[PDB]
Design a protein around this ligand. Structure first.
Ligand code: HDD
Ligand code: HDD
Ligand SMILES: [Ca+2]
Ligand SMILES: [Ca+2]
Ligand SMILES: [Ca+2]
Lengths: 355, 671, 673
């Protein structure tokens, strides 16, 4: 992974470049930068960089040269190696070739084409294509970042740019930093939307294999471990990665509360035999509960399995009828409902929206 | 074997990039037929980038050199004296690579500069690579590795203008020699015919340092490595070597190459002098002092095995340029001594390869790889060519079952330091008083040369010292020379118009020692590969027949024969325009060509005679095969090494004894 | 000195580490007096680590070379043709540094190898460093930069055994030349006396490529750079160059160094041929083609100013080894053309410095620094010497108030590409057919040589081609040469025992051009620095007095005199043992020394051979004192030969001998076909 040296200049017959000025310059950079990384010019000879076909060329020497070349006439044209290696092109040897309809015309210029000048309509196209909750998240991210800019001329400059994309984004962002947004400038406003760019709107996940389920249990109650084991078996036969957490490690317990965290799971389940945990020298205060509250507040499916759920829900301040909140006595009926929540992945109704 | 796996064949196929994409490389991609070149022309940039980066730094010393692969064969099971695996059975064969080199020149400097020469041999043993990084000369200039950059600075070109290339004939070098008297012994060797050897095959190899042989039971003896050439010993004369430096900068690498190609690969007996630990100070000097030899009188040589060089590299850069020798490449059964020169060397060779290779993985280059499996926890670094499966690379571990295991004296045939070795005393930056005699052994060496050899050595000093600008440095040089031999200093001083100081005989003696003289070593034991130039003419059909008859008779005895005429044609190998007496070990003039020796547009005025005359001046066997011609040359027909016969078979019988004698020293005036 | 700020003085003081701690460096730290060395000895390891890392990679080409500082002085205000600031006022002065080199040999190889030569000039202008990275020869081998590694591989040593060093005399080079006929022009210059110049000071400089001059109003003209040597042009002879290569591999660097030290710093008129854009195809060939010259008959030179080298470096490695030239170091007022060899060079020079310097900050080396402030947002990288105050190194910014400001045609004196330049057509890897004539101009060049020069050229070809093993390659070479001149192919063919092919006259003509002949550029305009060897003897008190009188008179005219004798003493500079005819431009024997013309003090015949080599190589030679016939007869040198002198009078001898030194070479002494 560390030594792999990618290059857009590694191209094959049948593909070609375009005159995109960003692409064009990248072609120079990747060839040059591997000199820095490898410290010598023979970086294509590293295993991960080698091709899987024979190499026939007149490149020679350099620090780290791994090859011992037989051909002692590495120049073209030659007769002393019978004209080999032969030149490859469009008509012979399956040569790379530039697309023959490409042309250039005009002055040699260091100028920006005017066709590149609209910087605002597509960011607006993008913003219009996100759901209301996704819109809030994007606004919240900007409020987070721009609130940490010390320069009060930089924040004003940022609002000016955002304003040309969307007045509403500008106003909502400015509210977090106590500055007024500038007046609407609708040259680039529009209402078009486009498919495929929204995450929250691309449906439930088409699969839940590998998703991670944290089962919060206890060693005080041997029935809590039984409830967890039962829950383990039925989750694992659907390919979820299941972690049973308790106070200490023992058979059937994967992690301790001390190392467990809500970022470690895509769904959190409490077995109702463990309800008491919801102080100790073995984990920080409030840890088992905090795992539950965090997963809840981050929009993850959460639940209590076994039938007594109100002690847990009440302590967590999680409503029993909330979307993404599961309480069932039967393990089987629990898993079926919970697995739908895992596919939904995030329960977006737990986050507030600007009016 | 790592070598064969990495050979790349380009005798067929289409041009590709380094990632296997077929391409062209003859024209740049341009915006129109007369337009500017495009940045997106990746074919251009990958080829030129490779070209821009082809060069690596030259070795700090021994930058000019040439190598060959071969085989070492042991003559016996040597477990009586050493645990070394490559020496543990009669006939046991181990592949080698050897590089020979000068010391001071940069990578494109002349083979035939006067210099000390490197002789570095790698044994790819079945217990690891073992390197003997040795010399043509048994003693070194200095007694402490910390002085190496001082010596090298002073012998390398002056740092303001970088003059002179590959030469001690300037003020700084002789300033250093005259202030650092440890230099005397090696200086005398480099000023004798040893500094200008006739080829790499005609020099011996020495480890210089005293090392240890260590048995599996832990006892050790002290050793010197001596590689004794089977080709005999031979040198050029100075005036010839200078001309050669300009006519053929590649003379030794060519010689080594051609010898191997023609089935004449050179050979050396790998020997040691062996002495007990208790003899460290018994010979009248300290065996830790690298400026001294053990005279063969006090310790004879034992023959351990045969070193043969018999295959040329496939790519000079990948093999000869990249080979990275280290005295730290040692195997069980060999150990170091407290020789302060050797001690410091161990640090430098590991460190200098980061400069050359630009990365820490230089032992992965095919020429540096061992022939046995590598088990260790070294990881990562630039240019990492391995993919390690062990994901617990630390000791002690249980996660990889305690592997790799520690190897030591008891377990895994591990290298181990000779267990008898001790240290005692203050931590000091002090030179041992036992190292203080700088002059007796150079005198011993001088005493052991023949009169003519002694004259060449005086003449070499006269030549160099006469080039030193500073009158003070010249006096200081006479002061030191005088302490080796009053006579040397007197004779040297005559050439530079100074008076020698008065005799100071504290170090004078009359002792000689065997095996250090080139002239005194008798005629060459083989004449295969020696070069004969036949000077002939296209004007006379007789001349070309005399030449062709001589050819076939010389060629059978393995001589390399070159027929020279005005212009090339069947039977003629070289023109007069490109021929020089330095191209040959003997010159024969076929009498059919007598007219050429009295002008032509095909060659410079006087060239044919000058070839013959230079050859004679330089001590070479010369002949005429049919005379009158010996007079145009001023060559006395009765002189030794001058052959005149009408007969073809008797010319050759006689002339070949000439080649064997090699040099005719009566042609040189003595003081 | 322009780099005084970076100088380190070690004429006094105690040895220290690189961090200022006083230390010793002569003995290693040992456990006991005969003990092993200690790892804790940092004095040893810092000192050896430095030494272990002293070497850097040599240049990929032009590895062997030498340099000096100087001054360029403008002869006028050149704003009428160029916006370039270093040319904007009469008498404006700009520090330069120049490096001269051969092309193919490694470091250490001999200065007098037969080769093309590099002539690279840096102008440290008040508007940035500007480099002209040029040559001693006006044309290059190949027409597209992409072919450079092919040319360089074929001419460099063969890669199995690395033989031969610094020489085109081997199969691969001639295979390339014969298969790639664009090579013929440069090949004929290399094979002539231009391949073996007498010194760096006796050669001209050329940009090779057409460049553009651009005025502040944006109009442009096409230029060729010509640096005309004020010392005159002079070559060696091949047989001499070969001996020199072995007797003094440092010949050109020493000649340069001594010339500057004696106050004889070499000079050039820096000139241009200027032509209009619309003449790109007017002269019978394409100005974008680097294998062609604009004959002087068609576009005369304009002298722009004086280049003088007058100061040697202090540290060769720091200055000459590390200087890193780039045609990308360009300044406002100059621009590139679409020459495909030039276009690709732009890329290589920037890239190859990463190799040599081992890191991206090579422009911070003292020798590469500009002489004006640097304001940009380049940061970090290995070996970063600067400490940048601006913590907002991006554009556009407000947090650093929009600085540094963008420079262009209308603000900040920015570089700008010539506004009239355009491209049109398909994106192609095709050669323009306007580049297709490879033979007419090598023929033009050959015609403009004197008959003796033509003989030398033929003889250089015979010498090299006779060393090619492959009979196919040799045949292929006669095929190309034959397209240039049937006569050259016949005469070379004769040396190698092969018939020349039938005349093929598509490209034959009788046209000649001025200023490419060395032997026809009259006598040298100055003899200062020329080397006179006086052979003499210690046996005779009177030979040393003739030598002294002769020294005094010659040194008066700035000639470098060496008295040679058996042994050194007052007034004798060199022994016969070290002297050779290659060390001198002229050889005089004082007639007190007639007897020398065998000893333990020099090889047999050495004194005579010095005189005979000097005569045979075309040098002025003579005998001074009045009795000449004994020296001259021993040498087979006729008393009435041109460039042979005999006079009793010192005054008269010298006046005649100095005319010979100006003629420099007496060409009547070499046979013709
Ligand atoms: C501590 C500095 C030092 C000292 C005291 C020596 N050397 Fe060394 N030697 C080096 C530092 C070095 C070096 C800088 O590390 C080189 C340069 C490139 C390399 O591999 O190591 C080297 C190269 C080198 C080579 C070239 C290897 C090859 O062909 O690649 C030979 C033959 C020697 N040395 C031999 C000797 C001998 C016989 C020495 C004294 C007995 C000696 N060296 C002392
Ligand atoms: C595409 C590669 C390429 C091509 C087509 C050329 N060169 Fe070049 N040249 C290099 C790539 C290069 C290089 C590999 O980049 C060097 C080696 C070290 C360096 O600084 O640049 C170089 C070095 C170099 C030097 C040495 C500068 C110095 O002393 O440090 C000179 C004078 C020239 N070149 C001149 C020329 C001329 C007159 C050319 C044809 C008109 C030419 N080069 C074509
Ligand atoms: Ca590096
Ligand atoms: Ca010096
Ligand atoms: Ca070749």
């Amino acid at each position: 992974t560390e030594q792999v040296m990618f290059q857009p200049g590694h191209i094959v017959r049948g593909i070609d470049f375009t005159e995109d000025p960003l692409l064009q310059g990248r072609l120079f950079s990747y060839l040059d930068t591997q000199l820095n990384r490898n410290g010598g010019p023979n970086f294509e000879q590293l295993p991960i960089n080698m091709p899987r076909v024979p190499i026939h060329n007149n490149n020679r020497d350099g620090a780290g040269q791994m090859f011992i070349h037989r051909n002692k006439y590495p120049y073209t044209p030659n007769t002393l190696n019978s004209g080999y290696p032969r030149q490859a092109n469009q008509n012979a040897g399956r040569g790379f070739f530039t697309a023959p309809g490409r042309t250039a015309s005009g002055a040699l210029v260091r100028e920006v084409s005017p066709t590149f000048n609209d910087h605002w309509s597509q960011p607006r196209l993008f913003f219009n294509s996100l759901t209301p909750v996704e819109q809030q998240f994007l606004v919240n991210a900007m409020r987070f970042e721009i609130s940490l800019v010390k320069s009060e001329e930089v924040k004003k400059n940022v609002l000016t740019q955002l304003n040309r994309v969307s007045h509403d984004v500008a106003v909502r962002v400015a509210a977090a930093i106590g500055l007024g947004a500038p007046d609407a400038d609708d040259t680039y406003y529009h209402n078009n939307k486009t498919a495929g760019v929204s995450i929250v709107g691309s449906g439930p996940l088409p699969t839940i294999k590998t998703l991670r389920v944290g089962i919060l249990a206890t060693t005080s109650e041997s029935s809590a471990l039984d409830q967890a084991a039962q829950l383990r078996t039925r989750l694992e036969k659907d390919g979820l990665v299941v972690t049973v957490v308790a106070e200490t490690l023992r058979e059937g317990v994967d992690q301790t509360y001390s190392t467990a965290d809500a970022t470690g799971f895509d769904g959190v389940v409490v077995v109702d035999g463990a309800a008491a945990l919801f102080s100790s020298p073995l984990f920080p205060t409030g840890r088992p509960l905090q795992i539950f509250v965090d997963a809840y507040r981050w929009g993850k499916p959460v639940g209590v399995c076994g039938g007594k759920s109100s002690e847990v829900l009440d302590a967590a301040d999680v409503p029993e009828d909330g979307d993404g909140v599961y309480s069932e006595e039967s393990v089987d009926m629990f898993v079926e409902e919970f697995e739908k929540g895992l596919a939904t992945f995030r329960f977006t109704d737990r986050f507030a929206l600007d009016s | 074997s790592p070598l064969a796996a990495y050979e790349v064949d380009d005798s067929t196929g289409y041009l590709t990039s380094d990632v296997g994409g077929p391409i062209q490389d003859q024209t740049s991609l341009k915006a129109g037929i007369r337009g500017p070149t495009l940045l997106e022309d990746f074919m251009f940039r990958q080829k030129i980038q490779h070209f821009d980066h082809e060069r690596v730094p030259e070795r700090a010393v021994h930058a000019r050199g040439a190598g060959a692969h071969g085989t070492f064969t042991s003559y016996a099971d040597w477990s009586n004296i050493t645990a070394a695996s490559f020496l543990n059975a009669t006939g046991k064969q181990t592949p080698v690579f050897v590089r020979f080199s000068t010391v001071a020149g940069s990578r494109g400097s002349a083979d035939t500069a006067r210099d000390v020469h490197g002789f570095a041999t790698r044994f790819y043993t079945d217990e690891g690579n073992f390197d003997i990084v040795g010399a043509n000369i048994p003693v070194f200039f200095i007694q402490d590795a910390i002085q190496f950059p001082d010596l090298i600075h002073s012998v390398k070109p002056r740092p303001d203008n970088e003059i002179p290339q590959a030469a001690t004939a300037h003020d700084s070098a002789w300033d250093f020699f005259s202030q650092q008297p440890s230099t005397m012994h090696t200086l005398f060797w480099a000023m004798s015919g040893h500094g200008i050897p006739r080829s790499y095959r005609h020099m011996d190899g020495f480890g210089v340092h005293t090392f240890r042989f260590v048995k599996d039971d832990g006892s050790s003896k002290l050793i010197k490595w001596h590689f004794k050439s089977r080709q005999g010993k031979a040198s050029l004369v100075w005036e010839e070597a200078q001309v050669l430096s300009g006519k053929n900068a590649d003379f030794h690498r060519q010689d080594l190459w051609d010898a191997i190609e023609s089935g004449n690969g050179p050979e050396w007996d790998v020997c040691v002098q062996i002495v007990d630990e208790s003899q460290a100070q018994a010979f009248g000097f300290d065996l830790l002092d690298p400026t001294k030899i053990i005279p063969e009188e006090y310790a004879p040589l034992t023959k351990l095995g045969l070193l043969k060089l018999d295959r040329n590299p496939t790519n000079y850069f990948a093999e000869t340029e990249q080979v990275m020798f280290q005295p730290g490449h040692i195997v069980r059964g060999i150990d170091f001594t407290e020789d302060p020169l050797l001690q410091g060397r161990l640090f430098s060779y590991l460190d200098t390869q980061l400069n050359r290779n630009g990365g820490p993985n230089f032992e992965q280059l095919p020429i540096n790889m061992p022939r046995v499996p590598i088990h260790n926890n070294n990881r990562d670094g630039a240019g990492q060519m391995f993919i390690h499966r062990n994901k617990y690379p630390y000791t002690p571990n249980t996660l990889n079952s305690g592997y790799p295991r520690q190897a030591n004296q008891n377990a895994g045939r591990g290298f181990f330091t000779a267990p008898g070795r001790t240290a005692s005393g203050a931590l000091v930056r002090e030179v041992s008083p036992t190292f203080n005699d700088h002059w007796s052994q150079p005198r011993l060496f001088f005493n052991s040369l023949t009169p003519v050899e002694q004259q060449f050595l005086v003449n070499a000093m006269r030549f160099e010292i006469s080039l030193v600008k500073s009158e003070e440095v010249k006096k200081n040089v006479l002061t030191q020379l005088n302490r080796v031999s009053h006579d040397v200093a007197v004779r040297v001083a005559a050439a530079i118009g100074l008076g020698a100081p008065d005799a100071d005989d504290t170090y004078y003696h009359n002792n000689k020692t065997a095996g250090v003289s080139i002239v005194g070593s008798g005629p060459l034991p083989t004449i295969k590969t020696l070069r004969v130039g036949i000077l002939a003419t296209t004007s006379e059909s007789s001349a070309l027949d005399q030449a062709a008859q001589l050819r076939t008779r010389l060629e059978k005895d393995g001589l390399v024969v070159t027929v020279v005429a005005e212009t090339l044609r069947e039977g003629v190998d070289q023109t007069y325009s490109t021929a020089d007496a330095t191209g040959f070990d003997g010159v024969v003039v076929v009498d059919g060509a007598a007219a050429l020796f009295a002008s032509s547009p095909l060659f410079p005025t006087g060239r044919p005679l000058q070839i013959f005359v230079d050859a004679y001046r330089w001590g070479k066997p010369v002949g005429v095969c049919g005379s009158e011609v010996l007079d145009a040359a001023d060559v006395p027909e009765d002189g030794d090494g001058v052959y005149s016969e009408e007969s073809v078979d008797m010319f050759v019988e006689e002339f070949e004894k000439g080649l064997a004698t090699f040099r005719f020293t009566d042609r040189f005036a003595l003081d």
